[PDB]
């Protein structure tokens, strides 16, 4: 894990998931607050995943593969989102610098996949 994956970015964001049944965003992991969100590159397989942990209690709130061809939506300068076959994820970044860091890394991953 540490043997196989390298972080390519870390950004400060409140990680949300979309409750489509209720038509509203809810905090990932059930607890509002900011997380440190990484993109990890598994260099052996050339695969990537998003992993986020709450700053306070370190709970893992997001751990999702980045599939080839993903459409990454920069809705605003500080809120970005994407979806999989299961969930819609949203990142409410702590600053535009954090958003640029994460988007830059996500776009690199999507070029490299």
């Amino acid at each position: 894990g540490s043997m196989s994956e390298q972080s390519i970015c870390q950004a400060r964001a409140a990680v949300m998931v979309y409750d489509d049944a209720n038509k509203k965003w809810v905090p990932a992991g059930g607890s509002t607050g900011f997380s440190r969100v990484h993109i990890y590159h598994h260099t052996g397989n050339n695969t990537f995943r998003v992993v986020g942990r709450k700053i306070q209690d370190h709970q893992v709130v997001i751990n999702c593969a980045i599939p080839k061809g993903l459409k990454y939506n920069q809705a605003t300068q500080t809120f970005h989102q994407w979806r999989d076959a299961r969930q819609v994820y949203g990142l409410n970044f702590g600053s535009k610098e954090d958003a640029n860091v994460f988007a830059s890394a996500m776009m690199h991953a999507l070029e490299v996949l």
Binding site: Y18, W25, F79, Q81, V88, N92
Partner: peptide, 5 residues
């Protein structure tokens, strides 16, 4: 994609 919160 749904609207931001």
């Amino acid at each position: 994609x749904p609207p931001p919160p």
